[PDB]
């Protein structure tokens, strides 16, 4: 266990954060992070190593967020981050850049072995992209798929797909 809040919890914070944002004129963002080439790592190193990587990734994500932001594991190799309140989309991209830059440093395994991985991020914005939690999540999900598709270790802002 990574000790990070789960999906259910994340969806809750989102609903309320979305309200707060709408009530008072503010912006919020949902970022989706997918560890690059996770499967290959498992096959070659095993699931035990995969976990150690997830844990490390969890810390590297949290260590780059404001105490106001939220980090939760959607499951397996994917994480979901809440950026609220946001002053603009530029900030959301700024934080994503930082998250991807923190992964540039190799991950030291329990037996001295090193593992270098990348983070693919899909950024969905409110209220530009979506007006509700579901859609905002779906948008961050799809934008995170295309990124994996176009390039990995990259961030991608949703647009009509």
Residue numbers in the entry: 254 to 414
Question: What is the paper's account of this structure, in its own sentences?
Answer:
In order to gain structural insights on the allosteric regulation of YfiN, we expressed the cytosolic portion of the protein, including the HAMP and the GGDEF cyclase domain (YfiNHAMP-GGDEF; residues 183-435). The solved structure confirmed that YfiNHAMP-GGDEF had actually undergone proteolysis and that only the GGDEF domain had crystallized (YfiNGGDEF). In particular, the second arginine necessary to form an inactive GGDEF/GGDEF dimer, is substituted with Asp-273.
YfiN, also called TpbB, is a multi-domain membrane enzyme connecting periplasmic stimuli to cytosolic c-di-GMP production by an allosteric inside-out signaling mechanism that, due to the lack of structural data, is still largely hypothetical. Formation of SCVs depends on enhanced c-di-GMP output by YfiN, which elevates transcription of the pel operon. The negative regulator YfiR is a dimeric periplasmic protein which controls the activity of YfiN by binding to the PAS domain of the DGC.
